[PDB]
Each structure stands twice: as structure tokens, then as C-alpha cells.
């Protein structure tokens, strides 16, 4: 259980490893030590002797006794069991070749060293091909099936062991250190060198192509090993014969899992995009689809039937070894909106890919939200391809994989980085279509994902870059990335603006304290008429006070000024790039966003001097709200409406506002329980402890010079809770639904890492409120020593959302001096920017450590210091986070030093695979309070007679369930695993990747949204419309099918919910008569 490694107690600084072994000779057996305050022994049997002798205190060195402390991690991972460290055995890789018994031996390796580590979920194979020792770490979770095979004749039936893998292994390499090996405080088996993640070492590239591992164990008496530790072991044995897999060798490092060029004119959009996807998903083996018989059969029939049958094949769980038989069964005995829907529903049928470190995993055409480039190029939607780089497990690609990071002396990019660069340059070659790099978005860059486009005959892969307005005369990499990503972020197209309508005004600057500072970085002003026009254009009945635009090549948030008459009044400080597209791209406007704390904000507030036990009251209110949602109607407009982003448009809001209790309708109860679990998990992970007073407002300013330094104007549309109890010491009446904050206000940005970004400004009143009309927006001052948005980390008014809360409970008494926040030098290079440069920028971001790890390092280092956030390590982490944020402007990757690495994590963070310590120091009580809170009927008549009491008896709901309920079941079988019949962006219990949740939920959300819309489209098509005999009849039929016939083989509970708006409206109308 200790892996033969025991941590030592306090030791003298002049401890000698060599003398320790000689002393250990007089203390234990001969050569019983494996590595050398931690000491690792050769066997676990002598550990008990060592542990017992430690209590006797016999060992001593230089008048300082040494004790065996609690068990820690092994110095070098070797399995305690001698028989678990198999040595000098043979490994083969391939696929079962359509028969479960013919292993396609892609490559044979002899001398493989197998280490079946049991305490840690990992299986290690060491391959010494050529002169490099390349480790193969299978990992327990990867294994989908382990089998005892019979490679030889019937004698010695258990002669080989076969491991069916799904995600593929992690391949490493050994590099010389050329440094001293002792360093006082020491292995004995020459375990030098380090593991750098590397692409497949096989020339034929078998490891990528292969989906199974067969181990040729010398003896069959290894039943003790290869057991329930190795997942999915069935006692049934199978006789395995080897074949020749030389026809599957591929020398192209790109896409090492695709077929060959043995196809005449087969359509790739319906076969190659599906057959290869099936191979990657392991529904059919590579030979099962590369055989000429299946290819010819698939070419035989039309593309629609082929796509349907291949989708049905993908719906299967286990491997379909003989797809020819399946296709014959579903074709001979077949029993037998639009592609250009981007302009109508903005949903893409993207051919997303997952380029792992040593493989390719296409996920077929999955429906997702569209974007501007494909919105225009919808004629060639099948040609686009979203390529995401992952880590052989669909998780975030570690910075250790793409770079050595930390004694290294100089960062040397690993072979995975070169593979990423080559696969970006040469491109993905899926048959006839060869996908080339086009561009990426900012969030797309965060997602480790790239957009690729193939050189089509009508449109070339280079012409799209010409159309998008990038890579023509761009001088810096940062502005090239900004231009590439500006038109990819989700934005809606407003009205077109005249070129002469925009009227530039001088940028407001102060230039004090040495560093140059600009007050209005991205603050423009709209005329009232144009503001109204863009209000209808966006879809708002009122006039928002500020709009975050992307009009032209200039990005920023532009307010509404009733005094000015200029149409747009563009700013010169908005300098991003130059473009001729004079169309406003409004992304977000000013909402009264309900406020919610983050862990970094809590840490900074506690550091500044806010009582730690004072946040616990706000979380107590939060958990009182959360615990009374499955039993009380108070959740109707308190949890779903406020804590979750659901607005009044949600069906649950309708059916709770005027409907029954949370425990009445089983569908309502299940949805509210889903929300309960989601909110509890969020609060436990991300301490979104809602502050009732205060909001996250969009940073703006008033161009009229009244507001002074330390003064802010904040107007908020009061919530219902604040409307019921208004007129406090912090609010001042302005209208029936609005009030201006008068008390102290604390302001910080969303990251809020460095202690001092917390600026407790003064909220004041201006007589010119009717002159300006600023609403739901934080008005920063125009004059002063330093711009207030610059104080909040390195923020600026480019559309930033600034934290505000008026509670004296959490307001600091004092400020800490903020950082300089020096601007990023553009560094306009003469060499222009090429595709290779932006590819290098992408790979450099791959190397750069993400903001999440820096934030969690700051949090972990902030709980064990006399000063919570003012610690020196916290300051270095804050500066490094500033550098990482500025990386989008300066091509300098952010590598976190190993000194700031979190060696052990608190219990608030569920980092189970790491040392864990209780965090009773600083806001650690929040996690355990959340844990304590967490660890504490026929309705057919009501659904039908109270809303559609007329006897419909349409009975079309049975047919709908036969096609829409079956569709929901198929959609759930595609990705879901639980009984969530109406997921609606619900968090599935299974988390294969995690680390991707938004992308993973989007696949479930978009499919559920489309299916409900498809059911609504099916419902509308089946509806004959007055809609009394059609809509009410359909609602009543759905209610009868779901609620009255729940015992039937449907188990939907949500088919009436798709049309639930009509049912709820009818119930509300008929509440008078009942
Ligand atoms: Mg910004």
C-alpha cells in the first residue's frame, strides 16, 4: 500500500545517502533499499521491519534520531508486487479484424517491460525501439476490456493477455541529463532522465492506428494480476491468431487513423466522414471498414440511407465486428430542416476533430452554434472543420506535453509541439479534402481548437483569409490574432453605419505617475436616435445605456449620449485593426446582472481585512435559498430566475410563477432537482455566494466632467426583492424601478487576483442624471490621478464587467496600492505576419500555462500565510497572471516556476489525485458548510382537464412518441447515460473529459434544443390551426400519453413539456372554470 516508499522524519542537513545504505545494512537486509527526506526500499516486506524498527528508535545518525513518517508518493513509480513488474515480454498492437480472434499485428515489440501499477491507475510498457526508451502508459480508465487470449494452440490456454483500449496511451521518451546523479539527498537502478511526451515512435505509426494491446506473458499463472484492478475482465477466454497488418502502415504523422487511397469516387461527406469516425469511436475496426466488400456495398446505395445506417451503427455500444452483416441486415431487410439552415437557425453541422498527441478522433457532423465566417460560407459548410488539440483523453493538453517547462535551462519544445505545428501547416488530409488553417477565435484559442478549411474548387483556402480581412498588411501578431478572432465571437449584426457618420473625438489621457494612462480606452457615445435604432436591431424594447460593439475594425463599448448628435462617435483609443466592414457587431449590452462572488474576490476581501466568518452568513442565506427549492415555491423567482441565468422565458418560470408546487409535477420536480444539484455543485466548486445588494455592471463613463477621483455613479434597476424593501441608507429613489447608489461601493474586475484591485470607490449623485440617462452601468470618473478601471487588475472600459456591491459586510476599510499595469508594446515587426507566425503563436499559447492553474496556485498559497494575499509568492503569481492575460497582446508564453507549483491542495478543491490538507484558515469553512448543507401521483387530469378539458382523443401523441420519443431516446443514447429524457443543457452524471464542460454541454444542449424544436415543428406540422382544435388537442394528447400512460413503453415525461407553453396558457385561461 506504501509502494515500498516511506517518508523520513526530521534529518540533519548533512545527511549522507551512501552512509544511509551502509547504516541500513546494520539496520535491515542486504541491498534492500531502492532509492534515497524520503527513502524507498526494494520490497514492501522489509517496510514492516523498517516501520517496526523506527518505533524502537534503533536508527540514529549524528545525535539526531530519524523516524519513519507517514507514507508519501514514491520517488520513482515501481509496483510493490515483484510479479506485477513483468520483464522481457512481447507486445503487439492492432484491431481484431472483424472476427474478435484475428489480431492485426501492426508492429511487434520484444523486450517490453510491463509494470502493472495497482495503487496508481496506470499500466506501463517500456519499448526500446532504436536507441530511445519510449514508455507507454495505458492508464486504467483507458482500458475498456481486458481478455485472456490463446496465441498458441489449445495447450496453455491462457498464454496471451489482450487489452482493448479506447483513448490511447501516453508515449514518452528518455533524454540524457548530463548532470551529477547523487546530489547528496539517489536511485540504484539507473533511473535517470525525464519523461517528455512524444508522438508515436513507430515508423509505420502502429500506436496511433492500433486500438488494442496484446501482451505475451510467459506464464499463465498470473491470475492474481490482471484482475478487477484491470477494468472489465470477463472470465471467458478466446483463442487469438495473428495476421499481417502491413497494409495498414502509414508514414504520414497527420491523421494516423484514417483509411488508404483505395476509393475510386466514394463520397467523403457521407462515408469517409462516417467510416473513419466509426473507426475512431471503435464501433467498427479499421479492417472492418477498409475491406473492399463493405466499401462497395456502401457505394451501392444512396448517401441518405448510408448516412442513416452509419448513424445507427454509431448508436451501438460494443464493437460491431462485421459491419457488412449489419449493413446487409438493415438494407436487404431495410424496412423503409435543410443543410442551409445557418441563415435560418444559426446552427452549424461542423465536422469537429480531436487531434490527440498521437492520433486523430473525428466526431462526425454535430450540431452547434454557427459563426459569421461559416454564416457567409454556408454554401461550403461541409468543408469547414474545427480541430481541437487534446491529450489522448479528450482533456486539456498539459503544458508539460507541448514543452519541457521546469532544470529546463532553456524551454525546448517537445516533439508534440512540432507535431502541432506540422499538422497546422501541412493540414489534415481526409481523403480528397485537405483541410488548411484559416483562423481561430480568442475563446477558440482557450479551447485548444483551430478552424480548418479545405481547398475547394470554387473557393480556395486562401481566399477565405482575404474575405475575413486578415493577413493582408498586418504588422503585429497580436493584431492579426485580434482580426482573426473578432468576427468569430458570438455577435449579432446591427445596422450598417455610414463611413462619414462616425465622428472621432480626442482620446482622454492623463499620463501621470510616469506610466501613460488613458481614461477612455474603449468608450464611445451614440446619439439617441441611433441608440433607439440599434435597440430595435438588437431586440430590446428599452434603450440600453451602452453597447459592446465591433463596428469596423474597432472594438469597444459605446454608451448613449442624448446631448450629442453624432451617429456613432467612434474613438481613436479603440485601435485594434482597419477594415471596410462598416457594420455594427453588438455582442452584449448593459444588463442588471445579478452579482456573485468568486474565490479570488473572496480571498482578496479576506486579505484586506474582512472577517472570514462574515462570508459564511451570505452563504448561509444562499444555502437557505437552495435548500428550500425542492419543498417551497420561494424558488419560483429566487433560484432559477436569479442564481441561474434563466430569465422569464423559461418554461419552469411559467409553471412555478402561476403553477403548482415544486413537488407536484414529476417533470417539474426532476428539473428543479437538476437545478438544485447544478447550483450546489457550482457553489461547492466556484463559491458563487450571491450578494443581494450589488451587481456586475458594464464599465462606462460620463463625458461630462463632474465625477472626480474616488467617485463613481452607479444606477441599478432594482430587483423584486429590493423593490419590496426599498429606501435604505445606500439607495436613493430616482424612478419607480430605478435607484442610484449613495453609499460606499467596492469595485473589482472578474479575475481580481492581485491584492489592491479592490477599489472601494464612493458612489455619488449627479444632478445631470436626466441629462445623461445612464442606467445599469457603472460610470467611472473622467479626471483624476489614475483611471479607476485601470486599478482593477489591468482592466479597461472595452466592454468589461466590473464587480460592485454596496454591503458594508464585505467592504474593505482600506485599499492596497495597485500595480503599475504597464501597457503592452505593439512591437510592429518589419517581417509582416505569415501563417507560420500565427501557428507559432498558437503553439506558444499551448505552452503558456492557463489562467486556471495560476488562480488555483494563488488560492492555495493564500491560505497558509500571515498575509493572505500580500505574500511574495502571491505577488509573483499575480504578476505572472498579468503576463498571461497580456499574452494575447505580447507573444510571450507564461511558464509558472516549479517553486510556485502547488505541492498540496486544500479540501475546498477536490484535487483528489494530489496531497490534501484541511483548510480551516481562510474561507475554508465555506466548503464544509456547503458539504453539511448537501449532506443533510397521477397528474393527467390536472394537465388535461384543467387546460384542454375538451375530449380531444387525437391519439397522434402515440405516433409522435414513436418518432419524437424515439428520437429523444436516440439522442440520449448518442451522448447521455442517465435517465434525463429532457436534458436541456443539463449536467450529465458521466464526465469523460471534464477539466470542455461548456463544449460538452453544447452538444447535449443543441441536440435537445433542436429535438424539442423538431418536435415543435412536428407538432406545428401536425397542427391544423384557431388552434383550439389543433394546439389544445395536441397538448391534451401529449398529456394523456405522458402522464396517463406513464406505464407505457415511452418513459418520456417531457413530450407535453415541448408544447408546455400552450398547456400552461390554457391552464391559466381555464383556471377560472377549472
Ligand atoms: Mg478588456
UniProtKB/Swiss-Prot annotation:
It catalyses: RNA(n) + a ribonucleoside 5'-triphosphate = RNA(n+1) + diphosphate. Keywords: Magnesium, Metal-binding, Nucleotidyltransferase, Nucleus, RNA-binding, RNA-directed RNA polymerase, RNA-mediated gene silencing, Transferase. The keyword Nucleotide-binding does not apply. It holds the Pfam family PH_RDR2. It comes from Arabidopsis thaliana. One of its GO terms (biological process) is siRNA transcription. Interacts with NRPD1 and SHH1. Associates with Pol IV complex, forming an interpolymerase channel bridging their active sites, through which the Pol IV-generated transcript is handed over to the RDR2 active site after being backtracked, where it is used as the template for double-stranded RNA (dsRNA) synthesis. Interacts with JMJ24. One of its GO terms (cellular component) is nucleus. Belongs to the RdRP family. RDR2 is non-functional in the absence of associated Pol IV. Its EC number is 2.7.7.48. This is RNA-dependent RNA polymerase 2. It comes from the Eukaryota. The keyword Transferase applies. GO terms for molecular function: DNA/RNA hybrid binding; metal ion binding; RNA-directed RNA polymerase activity; single-stranded RNA binding. Its main location: nucleus.
